[PDB]
Amino acid sequence: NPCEKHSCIAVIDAGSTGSRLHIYSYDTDDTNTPIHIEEIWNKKIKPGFASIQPNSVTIDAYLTMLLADAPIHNIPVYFYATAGMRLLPQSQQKKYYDELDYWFRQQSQWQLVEAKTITGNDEALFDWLAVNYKLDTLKSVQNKSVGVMDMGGASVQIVFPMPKNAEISKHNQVELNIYGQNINLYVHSFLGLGQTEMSHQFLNSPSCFANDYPLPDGESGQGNAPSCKEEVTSLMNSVHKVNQQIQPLLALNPVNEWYSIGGISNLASSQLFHFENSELTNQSLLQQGDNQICHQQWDILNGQYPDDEYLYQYCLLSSYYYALMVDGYGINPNQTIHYIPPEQNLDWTIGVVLHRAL
Amino acid sequence: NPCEKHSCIAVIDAGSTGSRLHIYSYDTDDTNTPIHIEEIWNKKIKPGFASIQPNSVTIDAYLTMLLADAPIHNIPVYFYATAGMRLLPQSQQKKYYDELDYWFRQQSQWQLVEAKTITGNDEALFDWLAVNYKLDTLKSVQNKSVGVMDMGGASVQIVFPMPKNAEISKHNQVELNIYGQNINLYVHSFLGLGQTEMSHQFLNSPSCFANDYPLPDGESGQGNAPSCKEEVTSLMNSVHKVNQQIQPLLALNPVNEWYSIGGISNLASSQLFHFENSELTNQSLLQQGDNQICHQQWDILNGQYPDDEYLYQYCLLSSYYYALMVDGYGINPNQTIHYIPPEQNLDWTIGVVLHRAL
Numbered sequence: 001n002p003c004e005k006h007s008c009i010a011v012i013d014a015g016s017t018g019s020r021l022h023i024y025s026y027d028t029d030d031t032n033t034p035i036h037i038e039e040i041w042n043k044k045i046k047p048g049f050a051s052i053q054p055n056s057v058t059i060d061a062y063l064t065m066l067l068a069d070a071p072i073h074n075i076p077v078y079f080y081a082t083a084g085m086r087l088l089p090q091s092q093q094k095k096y097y098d099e100l101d102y103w104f105r106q107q108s109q110w111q112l113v114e115a116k117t118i119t120g121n122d123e124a125l126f127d128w129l130a131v132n133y134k135l136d137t138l139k140s141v142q143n144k145s146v147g148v149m150d151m152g153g154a155s156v157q158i159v160f161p162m163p164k165n166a167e168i169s170k171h172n173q174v175e176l177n178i179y180g181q182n183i184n185l186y187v188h189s190f191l192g193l194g195q196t197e198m199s200h201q202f203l204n205s206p207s208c209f210a211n212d213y214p215l216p217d218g219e220s221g222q223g224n225a226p227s228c229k230e231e232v233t234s235l236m237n238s239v240h241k242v243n244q245q246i247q248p249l250l251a252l253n254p255v256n257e258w259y260s261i262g263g264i265s266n267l268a269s270s271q272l273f274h275f276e277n278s279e280l281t282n283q284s285l286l287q288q289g290d291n292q293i294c295h296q297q298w299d300i301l302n303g304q305y306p307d308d309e310y311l312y313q314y315c316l317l318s319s320y321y322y323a324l325m326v327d328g329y330g331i332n333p334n335q336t337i338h339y340i341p342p343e344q345n346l347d348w349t350i351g352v353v354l355h356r357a358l
Numbered sequence: 359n360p361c362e363k364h365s366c367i368a369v370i371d372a373g374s375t376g377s378r379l380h381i382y383s384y385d386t387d388d389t390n391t392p393i394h395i396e397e398i399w400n401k402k403i404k405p406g407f408a409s410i411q412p413n414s415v416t417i418d419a420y421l422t423m424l425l426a427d428a429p430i431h432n433i434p435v436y437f438y439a440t441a442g443m444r445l446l447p448q449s450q451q452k453k454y455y456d457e458l459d460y461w462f463r464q465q466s467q468w469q470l471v472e473a474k475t476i477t478g479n480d481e482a483l484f485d486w487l488a489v490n491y492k493l494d495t496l497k498s499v500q501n502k503s504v505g506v507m508d509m510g511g512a513s514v515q516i517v518f519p520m521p522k523n524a525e526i527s528k529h530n531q532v533e534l535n536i537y538g539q540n541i542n543l544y545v546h547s548f549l550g551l552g553q554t555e556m557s558h559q560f561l562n563s564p565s566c567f568a569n570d571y572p573l574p575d576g577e578s579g580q581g582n583a584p585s586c587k588e589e590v591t592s593l594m595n596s597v598h599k600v601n602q603q604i605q606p607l608l609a610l611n612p613v614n615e616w617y618s619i620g621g622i623s624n625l626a627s628s629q630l631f632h633f634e635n636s637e638l639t640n641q642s643l644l645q646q647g648d649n650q651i652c653h654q655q656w657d658i659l660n661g662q663y664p665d666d667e668y669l670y671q672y673c674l675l676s677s678y679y680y681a682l683m684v685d686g687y688g689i690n691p692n693q694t695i696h697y698i699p700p701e702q703n704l705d706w707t708i709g710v711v712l713h714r715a716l
């Protein structure tokens with residue numbers, strides 16, 4: 001039991017598609033900032049917390065499933081929900097938290113510290129701290145600008161270094177001091193642009209699905225990734241103004257290396273796509289989606305790859321990631337995007353471990 | 359004892375936000391077409407069928423809650439799911455129907471005829487039949503064109519008379535003969551434009567919420583209906599091409615009387631609004647939304663209208679309806695839109711009772 005000799009906390013990422021519990025052990029440096037962070041337990045359950053009926057029976061079953069078999073308890077718990085809960089009004093979220101608070105008060109194995117819905121800006125902060133912690137880039141001042149994207153089911157986040165600016169909302173800027181360094185970040189979350197919510201605007205777009213895929217309205221798929229990408233870009237830019245907001249900022253604050261977490265890691269590591277070195281380019285991602293999915297005959301392809309419940313969406317998802325990164329953020333189609341291997345189960349929760357001490 | 363004296367049928371509207379069972383008694387004319395249709399039972403349960411976990415335990419609980427206390431069980435049942443189920447791929451929908459089929463197989467009274475997801479086109483056909491049945495406009499050749507709109511959670515439908523047009527998809531046209539008359543309709547459904555799905559693209563738009571309403575990203579509402587309306591119009595037109603699809607047909611096939619069903623009845627019946635005769639105009643809805651909700655203080659509104667559960671969305675919905683009807687469909691903003699008093703619970707289910715006899 002590592003928690004007899006080190007500080008441990010539990011952090012639950014309560015996202016739109018499920019909840020992932022992590023238990024972390026760590027030591028602290030002489031500023032009481034965590035160091036030597038190790039994940040000692042990880043469990044994911046489905047569906048998302050926001051998608052269950054908020055009553056005591058259902059919440060008890062859900063929390064028992066998430067927590068009951070953890071090899072360690074008697075530790076502090078942070079339960080932080082993200083865009084799934086942000087899609088609900090505060091009045092509806094309150095019912096979930098009232099029941100969750102009651103569940104924790106009615107037991108003794110867990111010490112609930114906080115249970116709340118965090119803003120997308122906070123989530124973006126945690127995304128950047130978690131990834132940079134993992135890359136070991138937090139220790140000292142960097143030669144390089146490191147940008148992080150988190151591709152979620154309901155929101156997407158982007159975060160990159162930017163000197164503190166009196167022209168940009170305080171909400172979109174975070175200054176931190178960590179390991180004796182001062183770091184100023186631009187943070188942004190686009191609610192509605194996560195893959196599930198985005199996809200609900202394009203399910204009858206033939207260009208977004210393999211040939212003869214049965215669209216819900218009775219028409220047939222006729223896939224073409226550049227065309228599907230153009231459709232998605234209207235949501236990104238005509239509706240959300242992603243390009244107006246992000247591109248002028250990146251033009252002035254070049255990111256040297258991009259890292260992505262979230263769904264893109266699963267897409268890129270699937271049997272349908274082929275990437276080396278856990279990295280992709282948008283050019284290659286679009287081409288692969290276009291040729292390996294959009295221009296294929298659906299029935300034939302479906303029977304060939306029966307083992308992938310995302311298969312049907314791959315023409316759309318490859319098009320959407322390109323529309324987001326290239327047409328939205330302005331990233332060069334040939335720029336390397338590193339993605340964290342899905343086996344790592346890397347999310348923003350290390351950022352919570354780190355941030356409380358800053 | 360109506361079903362001892364008349365034919366009876368159960369029709370379930372399994373929509374995105376809940377399922378509504380109706381039991382109708384009816385007689386039939388010389389062609390065996392239903393006449394004298396009377397609702398004898400109505401029960402609504404939440405949440406939507408597509409929102410529950412598709413296992414035997416949860417489906418049993420849901421169908422028992424929907425059906426077990428009905429007064430009459432030995433009748434044909436139609437279970438038709440709409441846009442909530444259309445958001446899911448066929449592979450995922452199959453699990454729901456496999457389990458629901460199993461549940462019906464253990465009932466010795468209910469006679470399951472069909473359980474399936476209907477297309478938005480069929481939903482629109484049933485919309486128009488149900489409303490025109492209630493307006494008593496089906497029995498004879500009409501002087502005036504009656505158009506119908508159904509404002510759902512996940513899709514919206516529009517349907518109106520139009521002679522066969524060999525240049526328009528077969529899927530968007532229906533020809534029926536009912537009560538000795540020949541009717542040709544244009545039908546269209548827009549998946550992703552129902553109020554829940556569309557709202558998920560605008561939750562961080564301050565123009566769309568009352569002053570000081572807490573947005574998910576931590577900024578404050580600063581409502582302005584014309585500004586919110588312009589944002590929603592970008593989703594209507596730049597993304598879904600509503601106007602390009604619909605307006606040319608409506609200019610060539612004008613509608614004299616518009617009837618709406620679905621959510622608009624609930625909005626318009628709020629005490630925040632001043633409407634008479636169960637009708638509204640878009641210009642009145644937008645001006646009233648703008649003045650009494652968008653430009654008012656959230657904390658004040660919330661304490662002032664304790665019975666309006668969805669009050670927080672009223673600025674956005676006033677803007678959204680106008681964006682859809684006026685900027686999308688091209689309806690004049692001073693045109694009367696009749697809505698059905700919500701206490702009638704008029705949905706498209708009477709359409710199924712009529713249609714299956716043709």
Ligand SMILES: Nc1ncnc2c1ncn2[C@@H]1O[C@H](COP(=O)(O)O)[C@@H](O)[C@H]1O
Pocket residue numbers: 017018044151152153195196262263264266267268270310317
């Ligand atoms: N093969 C895949 N392709 C694309 N997205 C995926 C795939 N598998 C999972 N996802 C998405 O990845 C995110 C995290 O997945 P999970 O660990 O199942 O919560 C969700 O938004 C999923 O919808």
Ligand code: MOO
Pocket residue numbers: 014015016017082083084085151152153154155156194
């Ligand atoms: O709650 Mo999310 O799935 O990270 O957008």
Ligand code: MOO
Pocket residue numbers: 372373374375440441442443509510511512513514552
């Ligand atoms: O399933 Mo709907 O709520 O009528 O869009």
Ligand SMILES: [Cl-]
Pocket residue numbers: 204216217218444477478479547549
């Ligand atoms: Cl459809």
Ligand SMILES: [Cl-]
Pocket residue numbers: 086119120121189191562574575576
């Ligand atoms: Cl947010």
Ligand SMILES: [Mg+2]
Pocket residue numbers: 015016082152153347
């Ligand atoms: Mg997430």
Ligand SMILES: [Mg+2]
Pocket residue numbers: none
């Ligand atoms: Mg949803």
Ligand SMILES: [Mg+2]
Pocket residue numbers: 230231234596597598
């Ligand atoms: Mg477009």
Ligand SMILES: [Mg+2]
Pocket residue numbers: 361362366432
């Ligand atoms: Mg009988």
Ligand SMILES: [Mg+2]
Pocket residue numbers: 373374440510511620705
């Ligand atoms: Mg409906």
Ligand SMILES: [Mg+2]
Pocket residue numbers: 238239240588589592
């Ligand atoms: Mg716009």
Ligand code: NA
Pocket residue numbers: 196197198200554555556558
């Ligand atoms: Na949505």
